[PDB]
Design a protein around this ligand. Structure first.
Ligand code: A1EFM
Ligand code: A1EFM
Ligand code: YG7
Ligand code: YG7
Ligand code: CLR
Ligand code: CLR
Ligand code: CLR
Ligand code: CLR
Ligand code: CLR
Ligand code: CLR
Ligand code: CLR
Ligand code: CLR
Ligand code: CLR
Ligand code: CLR
Ligand code: CLR
Ligand code: CLR
Ligand code: CLR
Ligand code: CLR
Ligand code: CLR
Ligand code: CLR
Lengths: 558, 558
């Protein structure tokens, strides 16, 4: 097996599409710091421990996301589910890239399209804050999401053409610009994964340095804006009534698992190609810290831009922009237009966005391919044809999201395909590793790898804290489910049913695989359970009947 | 390899769902005998020769629909395409079975639902021909498909609930009755195919004798009906202006390939499990003759019932009923209601219909499984799990057809997924067998199998007549494509585009596989072509450069 070298003090999981695209609007939806508090809370007790656990497991088992369950086959279906979940996000992650690519084609012009009105895609209700005599902002200002801004009009009508679709029931025909963009994206992804997984300097060298510089420049220019004070005050304000709710915690947990890459198989695949003596402890600590800092500064800049647009458009910060997946493509272009030499900064920004998106998609596809090739070794000899199959099936399923109303399907996937299912997957993983496999054996493996055992804090998190919190958030997501909306359009009940069915398609993979393993094994019921709970490399112990999982000392070991 | 025994003088391909369900409405659409003439024409020169060719190939190669191209790998993709085409019909063939199953649940009642009006599913516009004082048949009789008949109302509103769907753009939610029916159908199909392919007496013993008796009784009762004369005259009338058209020939060719099972891989799989000394000549002759006779008598009875309903409802025969896939479920129940003891005859009829449908679906699924297991031998050791995968994927894709507007998707599949693609597949097969592989080698194989060479007629058909006619019908289908309609609703252009894309998904499998084989082989371009045109068991000849396909004598051999 090959070993990846090209690894700075902080892995690439710190800066990704989740922190630059998902975290902004996920935080803007849940007020201000009222989303930051649960974010850091689930990061210190759930996110970082599960990150460390997945990294250590991938480094010790030297296997993919699915095969690492050779120590406990009854949870191997979990290794499938997360992979499918990864594929799920691949249905809309590549589309986002396409969006940036389109913005790239809009960045080479001397006059940015999102600067003013008067274009073909713009509607008659287009309010230019810079110069507009017909602007009656002082009046007829509906208390709702302001879509009559040049950036929002260019996003929904020029890029997505949402005005040609009434809802999810009538998506229409896929836009040909987005079609060609997605084709280019999947071609680039195929030409980067077919000949094995190389260092891929093209995207790594960028994502290592350029996103930090771009975020720094954006924050420095935003704090100097006239409306920065209101946005800063809104971002630093703590709304305890939102903490009293339940959706904020679910969103924080989902954003944690998105930014840290836990629950998709990317961490396991990454650790499988690392050195056996690599210290995942310091790596996980630095990754979590830098990811938290990056999310904090990204939300700070986002709220600064929101306050600026609120001061310019004379609208409330709550209703100045949207709360969907296209919030950054409306806020950041407006801030770039204010920058001197908007063309160069826009080009650099959308080039950064493309690099982060391609990096995330490449990591996800590599995780999926590694899992399915470790499960079926034949795919290791046909990686090119296999890579084509994944990228092509992905294109056929990403066509729904590039349609005239594909943003609704994208939101449906981001809310149901990822969410309330990844939490269950990571919960089952933690239960299988700490309780079924044993937290003591995991600590012994970590000691064999790095030379030292984790502290009691990590053990209590892997065994008690994180599983309990995951079960709690899963229960509170199931009992307190809320209807999905694009902040102006309420999804129909059958759309929610389809989303729940898509989530169950990955959730039920664990009991189905349990039943399959129970029926595929030969012997008594107790012998089948022993075969399903003992490692595949120690099945001879089942012949000796010395199964530690059938002893109370195993379950009472911390 | 196992060998099937349970084979009467005429194989089960004579009486099938195509002759009892597809042929009736396909002939009623194309006038009367104006559809019979091209049917027999394509049967004597295209249908029977290709039937004999596929039977002999399956009996000689002892392989599935795809692997029989071991003599010419460049056409092996064709063996895939037909299999996919089979799967295509499996998307709507099982649904038809479900329909009959629902009718079975409607057959145990003492009062048939399709006898009169006054039910929940019936609309206010329900005209009972038996007794109705409000019947003003003498007036307000729109010159269109009469849907205000009890049988049609029970079919479209009681079974399909078509009134709740405006078109293909809004299919709605799948009906739960049809859902349970399709679940029962796929369960029965899985429990009949998992433990290998047995004789399956349950459906074979029925389909051998019961359909003939039921058709005989129906014809005898129909010829005695008062309106039988008009229907007989319409069926025996030859409309030459329809022969001057092009759609009639396409429909006749599609019905021939449906009734004979050519173009789906069922014939190859059937012949692969037969004795090596089995005479496919007499079998093909008797099969074609009995299939033609069965189609003729079925159309005769159908036109008799149409004339009866025209006499009762006082409507023209052209507009007395529909021309869709639900014509038999409207005509035959009306004739059964006139029979003495309608309950028993209805039960026997829908039991026959279920047997034929299950037999056709079992043959198609067995062909698909045999092809995919001969291509990948590993599936021979996991036939149960594989059978589940085919049946389940089939259920997930048949859900579109059991919806409130699933009849539109069913018609789309029956018109595009099967049609203009199966003709291209059988054309490529005939070209690869007669020209690339060699008609002389095929005749030598038939002589080795049966002890005698086919006549010059069969050679000229396999090499000249049938390929030319297939190319002609393919060209006339491509250049003279007509928009699809349910005789009252015109499908939108994007529906036709999706249908053409589904057809191309199977059509382009041949050039894609050609490119794949060319790129996967190592050597010069001429050596790659030689490897792609010579049999896999004679590739050593490529080393000796004595390839007969590179000689003019091979192409000029009859
Ligand atoms: C909502 C429907 C789920 C139906 C799907 C239900 C079959 C259950 C078989 C099953 O669980 O066997 C697995 C292998 O599974 C696979 O292949 C890929 C399966 C991907 C299909 C999931 C599609 C979900 C939308 C595990 O097989 P294994 O025995 O652990 O290993 C096989 C071989 O690699 C050993 O080296
Ligand atoms: C509209 C998209 C077509 C994309 C699909 C394009 C790949 C092309 C590979 C290809 O053509 O390899 C085939 C094997 O193919 C398969 O697997 C099943 C393929 C089924 C996918 C078709 C889905 C169509 C809706 C033939 O492989 P082989 O080299 O002849 O034999 C493999 C092994 O069985 C040898 O014993
Ligand atoms: N879908 C999805 C999804 C969802 C939520 C997510 N959060 C985070 C992600 C993934 C983002 C990180 C991707 N990694 C993988 C690629 N990269 C890397 C570095 C050095 C290397 O070196 C070699 C070599 N020597 O071959 C190869 C090689 C590769 C580092 C970054 C994600 C993805
Ligand atoms: N999809 C589709 C589709 C489309 C268009 C079509 N036209 C025609 C068809 C198929 C209808 C015929 C199916 N055959 C296969 C099953 N049967 C049979 C007889 C004796 C046997 O004996 C054994 C044993 N000893 O194991 C096993 C066994 C099986 C004979 C009938 C079709 C299908
Ligand atoms: C089926 C699995 C294995 C692969 C595909 C998964 C995703 C891409 C599928 C699963 C269910 C699908 C949805 C099911 C139904 C609808 C409603 C329709 O009016 C628009 C498309 C839409 C919204 C589909 C979009 C694509 C979708 C979300
Ligand atoms: C079926 C899959 C595998 C391949 C085909 C994908 C389909 C969905 C895609 C591929 C190319 C696309 C077309 C490309 C360009 C145009 C022109 C535009 O003015 C209307 C939409 C239209 C007509 C698109 C419709 C959707 C389309 C046909
Ligand atoms: C429908 C469209 C998008 C299909 C893809 C078309 C383009 C992108 C394809 C068609 C043929 C392809 C080329 C075929 C062969 C090679 C040689 C290989 O060593 C590197 C890639 C390279 C150079 C490919 C690059 C991508 C390519 C140019
Ligand atoms: C165990 C290995 C070494 C040999 C056996 C190879 C077989 C079992 C492997 C290799 C190719 C694989 C398939 C490739 C493609 C698909 C389509 C999609 O639905 C994902 C799973 C599925 C259905 C895979 C299932 C497992 C598979 C059939
Ligand atoms: C969704 C549809 C349209 C496309 C599906 C593409 C994927 C799932 C399919 C298409 C062709 C398939 C490949 C065909 C043949 C082989 C060679 C065999 O030795 C291992 C499996 C492997 C490598 C298959 C893996 C799965 C595969 C890549
Ligand atoms: C619409 C989107 C999904 C189309 C994507 C097409 C991609 C996946 C296809 C189109 C043509 C293909 C190439 C055609 C030929 C070759 C040369 C061969 O020696 C290696 C593979 C390679 C380089 C193929 C790689 C995959 C490829 C680039
Ligand atoms: C083989 C699998 C992976 C393919 C999955 C993708 C298929 C099911 C998707 C991809 C894009 C989709 C199309 C996108 C847009 C339209 C136009 C709309 O007015 C009717 C539906 C139609 C025509 C869709 C039909 C289904 C479709 C072709
Ligand atoms: C998705 C629907 C069908 C729900 C049921 C899914 C699960 C429970 C079913 C579907 C198909 C089933 C498998 C079908 C056939 C076999 C082979 C047999 O030798 C052992 C049991 C085994 C391996 C079954 C185990 C259970 C199974 C995996
Ligand atoms: C994609 C392949 C491999 C498997 C599925 C094939 C069949 C079942 C698919 C392919 C394209 C599909 C159609 C694409 C688009 C539409 C329009 C939508 O308004 C209703 C469903 C409908 C009419 C789909 C029905 C199912 C369909 C016909
Ligand atoms: C996603 C696949 C694999 C499994 C689920 C299939 C879906 C499409 C099926 C399975 C069961 C179905 C439901 C069964 C019964 C009812 C009640 C009826 O009054 C309205 C429709 C409704 C609510 C159906 C909607 C469609 C449904 C949810
Ligand atoms: C969602 C529904 C339709 C799933 C299927 C449920 C029913 C039909 C399933 C569930 C469990 C199944 C049984 C499980 C095991 C066996 C033993 C085997 O030797 C014969 C079949 C038999 C007896 C199965 C028959 C079908 C069965 C009863
Ligand atoms: C050559 C044999 C002996 C060993 C290799 C087994 C592999 C290559 C076989 C066995 C299982 C197969 C897959 C099973 C399921 C699917 C899903 C569907 O899209 C049809 C093809 C596809 C994708 C098959 C492709 C080929 C496959 C992956
Ligand atoms: C469409 C989706 C929902 C379901 C797809 C089901 C089919 C394509 C998949 C699901 C599970 C798969 C099987 C999983 C594992 C094995 C064992 C391996 O040694 C040969 C292939 C085989 C037997 C696979 C064949 C293809 C398979 C049956
Ligand atoms: C909605 C439809 C598709 C559901 C169909 C479910 C079918 C395919 C599933 C459900 C439960 C399954 C059964 C569960 C358990 C067993 C016992 C095992 O020893 C052999 C397989 C067998 C008998 C399975 C066969 C397949 C099965 C019957
Ligand atoms: C994995 C593959 C084989 C699955 C293919 C089947 C999927 C794509 C089909 C089967 C039945 C379909 C559903 C049937 C009916 C409805 C209700 C409608 O108002 C919106 C779309 C929706 C919710 C469909 C979504 C797509 C669907 C779930
Ligand atoms: C469906 C779209 C992508 C159109 C292109 C399809 C065909 C022409 C493409 C798609 C993927 C391609 C394959 C991808 C990778 C390889 C492996 C390489 O060692 C030989 C060529 C081969 C086997 C390619 C042959 C051409 C190929 C099969």
């Amino acid at each position: 097996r090959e070993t990846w070298d090209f690894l700075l003090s902080v892995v690439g999981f710190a800066v990704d599409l989740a922190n630059v695209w998902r975290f902004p609007y996920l935080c803007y939806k849940n007020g201000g710091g009222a989303f930051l508090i649960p974010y850091t809370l689930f990061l210190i007790i759930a996110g970082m421990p599960l990150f460390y656990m997945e990294l250590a497991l991938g480094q010790y088992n030297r296997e993919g996301a699915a095969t690492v369950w050779k120590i406990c086959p009854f949870f191997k279906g979990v290794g499938y589910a997360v992979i499918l979940i990864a594929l799920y996000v691949g249905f809309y992650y590549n589309v986002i890239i396409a969006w940036s690519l389109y913005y790239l084609f809009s960045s080479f012009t001397l006059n940015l399209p999102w600067t003013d009105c008067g274009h073909t895609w713009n509607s008659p209700n287009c309010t230019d804050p810079k110069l507009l005599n017909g602007s009656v902002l002082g009046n007829h200002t509906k208390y709702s999401k302001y879509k009559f801004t040049p950036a929002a009009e260019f996003y929904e009508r020029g890029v997505l053409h949402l005005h040609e679709s009434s809802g999810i029931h009538d998506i229409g025909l896929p836009q040909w610009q987005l079609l060609l963009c997605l084709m280019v994206v999947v071609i680039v992804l195929y030409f980067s994964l077919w000949k094995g997984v190389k260092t891929s300097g093209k995207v790594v060298w960028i994502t290592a340095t350029l996103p930090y510089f771009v975020l720094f420049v954006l924050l420095v220019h935003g704090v100097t804006l006239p409306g920065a004070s209101n946005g800063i005050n809104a971002y630093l304000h703590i709304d305890f009534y939102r903490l009293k709710e339940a959706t904020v915690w679910i969103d924080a947990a989902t954003q944690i698992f998105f930014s840290l890459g836990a629950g998709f198989g990317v961490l396991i695949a990454f650790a499988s190609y690392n050195k056996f003596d690599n210290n995942c402890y310091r790596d996980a600590l630095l990754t979590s810290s830098i990811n938290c800092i990056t999310s904090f500064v990204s939300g700070f800049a986002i709220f600064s831009i929101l306050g600026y647009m609120a001061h310019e458009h004379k609208v409330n910060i709550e209703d100045v922009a949207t709360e969907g997946a296209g919030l950054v493509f409306i806020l950041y272009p407006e801030a770039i237009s204010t920058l001197s030499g908007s063309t160069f900064w826009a080009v650099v920004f959308f080039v950064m966005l493309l690099a982060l998106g391609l990096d995330s998609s490449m990591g996800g596809m590599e995780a999926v391919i590694t899992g399915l090739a470790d499960d079926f070794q034949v795919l290791k000899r046909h990686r090119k044809l296999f890579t084509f199959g994944v990228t092509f099936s992905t294109f056929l399923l990403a066509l729904f999201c590039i349609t005239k109303g594909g943003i609704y399907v994208l939101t449906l996937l981001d809310t149901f395909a990822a969410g309330t299912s990844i939490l269950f997957a990571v919960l089952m993983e933690a239960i299988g590793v700490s309780w079924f496999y044993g937290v003591d054996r995991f600590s012994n493996d970590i000691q064999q790898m790095m030379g030292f055992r984790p502290g009691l804090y990590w053990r209590l998190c892997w065994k008690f804290v994180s599983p309990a919190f995951l079960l709690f958030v899963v229960v509170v997501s199931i009992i307190n489910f809320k209807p999905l909306t694009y902040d102006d359009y309420i999804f129909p009940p059958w759309a929610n049913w389809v989303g729940w069915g898509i989530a169950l398609s990955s959730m039920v993979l664990v009991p189905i695989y349990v039943i399959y393993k129970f029926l595929s094994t030969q012997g008594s019921l107790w012998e089948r359970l022993a075969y399903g709970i003992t490692p595949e490399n120690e099945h001879h112990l089942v012949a000796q009947r010395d199964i530690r999982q059938f002893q109370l000392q195993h379950w009472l070991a911390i």
